[PDB]
Amino acid sequence: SMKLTIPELSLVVLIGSSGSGKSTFAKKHFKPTEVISSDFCRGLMSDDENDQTVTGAAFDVLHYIVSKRLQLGKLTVVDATNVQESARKPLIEIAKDYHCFPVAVVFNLPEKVCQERNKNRTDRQVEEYVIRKHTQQMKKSIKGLQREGFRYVYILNSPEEVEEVVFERQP
Amino acid sequence: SMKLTIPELSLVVLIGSSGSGKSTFAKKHFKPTEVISSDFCRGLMSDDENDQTVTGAAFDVLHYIVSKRLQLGKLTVVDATNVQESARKPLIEIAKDYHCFPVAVVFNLPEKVCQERNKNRTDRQVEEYVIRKHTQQMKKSIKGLQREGFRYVYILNSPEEVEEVVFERQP
DNA sequence: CCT
Ligand SMILES: Nc1nc2c(ncn2[C@@H]2O[C@H](COP(=O)(O)OP(=O)(O)OP(=O)(O)O)[C@@H](O)[C@H]2O)c(=O)[nH]1
Ligand SMILES: Nc1nc2c(ncn2[C@@H]2O[C@H](COP(=O)(O)OP(=O)(O)OP(=O)(O)O)[C@@H](O)[C@H]2O)c(=O)[nH]1
Ligand SMILES: [Mg+2]
Ligand SMILES: [Mg+2]
């Protein structure tokens, strides 16, 4: 296995294109109440599936819920694309304010893996250009994550490595 | 600053071309007895500064000293180039054997910075082709370090980032 | 400088 160490109080930020397997991974490794996804926060704002007209409100709600869980000292996982620096920065600042380590888990998979998974999804699908763009953004982001303020940066480079991951939580 | 977290029980493996500043960095951040350098181990095998033939024995000696220190529960830093996967593999095995975390600290500096520091050092220089080779080997190594078994991988991407490092040791 |  590939062991990824995280502090008992962490903010775990998943970073990956649509189709990279972020939500699948979060379900496998974390309790449901530890995981706050952008899709869930959109669903609070709208009774339409994956409503694109409420994006800003949904991310405001995600930041708020994340902050209040960290205030209570509860480990939290942010399940969103997080491929833009502008997306990650508030999460780093929130972790700081609550004396929490921010941890990056990056799904560094080839674009084709994500494009192929996308076409077979039974929940929702995105257009090909979205995944092309996310993948470019993700790859561009890797080098500067430590400098951005992530205390541990874990990069997963294939489905096989993702599959092998085990988390070790430290008190 | 850039905070690098390491457990009190760590094997810290410095990875970098000749000239990248490994020994200077080790001296700034760790106690002298914590640092085992390949240069010191060659010196135990020969007073001939340029006796090429002692390299294999010197690394056997280095590995054994590291083993015994980790067995004693003493944090140890390996001060050698560590740019070949074959050099890192036995160090990872040692850390595992004594239930210690192997940590990678990578001096990802441009070849030119290393070449210039080599030209200007007054202690012991290497030939230009050596630094060209080391830098190529170092860059090729970065992606695979986590999969080799390093539990924390810290990449320093400029002299500015190297100077900003502070270690936080956690027990 | 793991030649
Ligand atoms: N074979 C295999 N398929 C996977 C794996 N992980 C995810 N998938 C499939 O890939 C598709 C996308 O997975 P998700 O976890 O929803 O991807 P995501 O990164 O959350 O995507 P977004 O929510 O759009 O950002 C789903 O149909 C998954 O079942 C995996 O580890 N192995
Ligand atoms: N300006 C500046 N010079 C440095 C720094 N670190 C090292 N140097 C200089 O670079 C030269 C080599 O530094 P070392 O620490 O000996 O490099 P090394 O990586 O141990 O080299 P090898 O033992 O040959 O593998 C010395 O002359 C240092 O004074 C630094 O952080 N800033
Ligand atoms: Mg998802
Ligand atoms: Mg040195």
Side-chain angles (χ1 to χ4, degrees), chain A residues 1-48 50-171, chain B residues 1-51 53-111 113-115 117-171:
Chain A
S1 61
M2 250 189 24
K3 304 179 196 174
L4 302 186
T5 305
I6 58 173
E8 229 151 73
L9 184 47
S10 300
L11 179 62
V12 184
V13 175
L14 306 183
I15 296 167
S17 171
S18 175
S20 60
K22 298 182 296 296
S23 303
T24 302
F25 177 96
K27 184 171 175 178
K28 179 185 169 182
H29 300 278
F30 295 96
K31 301 190 303 151
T33 57
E34 282 164 349
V35 178
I36 303 308
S37 71
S38 53
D39 282 352
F40 166 75
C41 290
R42 278 176 206 278
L44 293 175
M45 297 298 104
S46 177
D47 66 342
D48 298 340
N50 200 63
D51 189 337
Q52 294 302 290
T53 70
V54 300
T55 303
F59 280 100
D60 286 350
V61 169
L62 182 149
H63 294 153
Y64 202 85
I65 293 169
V66 167
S67 294
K68 294 284 159 181
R69 293 182 52 78
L70 293 184
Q71 177 187 303
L72 293 173
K74 287 148 177 303
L75 182 147
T76 305
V77 179
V78 181
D79 174 21
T81 76
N82 294 316
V83 297
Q84 302 216 70
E85 186 178 23
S86 63
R88 297 183 301 261
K89 180 55 172 191
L91 304 176
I92 295 157
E93 290 298 297
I94 285 166
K96 314 295 134 271
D97 280 351
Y98 299 99
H99 303 78
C100 291
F101 269 27
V103 175
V105 181
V106 180
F107 294 75
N108 187 27
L109 305 177
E111 183 199 329
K112 65 152 147 36
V113 169
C114 300
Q115 294 283 12
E116 295 174 352
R117 290 174 172 179
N118 182 55
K119 304 268 186 79
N120 300 296
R121 303 180 60 158
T122 58
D123 50 345
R124 58 184 164 80
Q125 295 187 15
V126 305
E127 304 200 347
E128 282 175 352
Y129 77 93
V130 174
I131 289 167
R132 189 180 331 108
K133 180 85 204 185
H134 283 174
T135 299
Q136 295 162 355
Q137 290 173 136
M138 178 274 297
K139 291 192 166 285
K140 184 178 82 239
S141 288
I142 288 163
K143 189 174 165 149
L145 296 170
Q146 194 90 45
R147 175 75 279 191
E148 281 184 21
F150 288 96
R151 289 291 291 269
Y152 298 141
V153 170
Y154 297 127
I155 312 287
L156 309 177
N157 293 306
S158 70
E160 288 76 359
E161 294 183 6
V162 167
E163 230 327 284
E164 222 180 327
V165 163
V166 174
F167 281 97
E168 277 194 15
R169 253 187 241 208
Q170 302 197 315
Chain B
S1 65
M2 171 167 298
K3 302 172 168 170
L4 302 193
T5 309
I6 57 167
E8 188 43 56
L9 279 158
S10 284
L11 181 57
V12 179
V13 177
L14 308 184
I15 297 170
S17 177
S18 175
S20 60
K22 299 180 297 293
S23 302
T24 298
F25 181 95
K27 183 179 181 189
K28 169 181 180 190
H29 294 283
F30 297 98
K31 299 195 299 208
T33 50
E34 291 176 336
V35 179
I36 312 299
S37 76
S38 52
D39 185 50
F40 173 78
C41 293
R42 291 190 169 91
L44 289 181
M45 299 294 103
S46 189
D47 59 343
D48 187 347
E49 177 147 50
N50 287 4
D51 187 351
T53 56
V54 303
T55 292
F59 282 96
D60 288 343
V61 169
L62 187 148
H63 297 158
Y64 195 63
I65 289 163
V66 166
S67 289
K68 289 284 150 174
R69 284 182 57 80
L70 295 188
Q71 190 173 33
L72 282 171
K74 290 159 186 269
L75 179 145
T76 303
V77 180
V78 176
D79 180 16
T81 57
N82 293 303
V83 297
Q84 294 176 23
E85 181 168 17
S86 68
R88 300 180 300 257
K89 187 195 201 192
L91 298 177
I92 292 161
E93 295 301 302
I94 290 168
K96 312 309 213 181
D97 287 339
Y98 299 105
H99 308 97
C100 277
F101 277 21
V103 174
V105 177
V106 178
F107 294 79
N108 184 28
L109 303 183
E111 185 189 333
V113 164
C114 294
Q115 297 280 19
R117 294 180 173 178
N118 181 61
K119 303 264 182 272
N120 289 322
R121 62 193 290 181
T122 53
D123 59 322
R124 57 157 154 103
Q125 299 176 296
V126 295
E127 294 186 58
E128 292 202 45
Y129 75 87
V130 175
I131 288 173
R132 179 168 44 103
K133 178 174 50 183
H134 287 174
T135 297
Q136 286 174 3
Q137 290 172 326
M138 177 278 296
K139 288 180 173 296
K140 229 155 61 165
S141 292
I142 287 171
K143 179 183 180 111
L145 295 169
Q146 194 89 45
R147 167 78 290 181
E148 290 183 20
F150 286 100
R151 289 288 299 263
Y152 295 145
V153 174
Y154 301 124
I155 314 298
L156 312 180
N157 292 302
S158 67
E160 293 61 52
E161 285 184 9
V162 177
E163 185 182 24
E164 284 203 18
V165 172
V166 54
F167 283 96
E168 299 227 316
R169 295 198 200 185
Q170 64 172 27

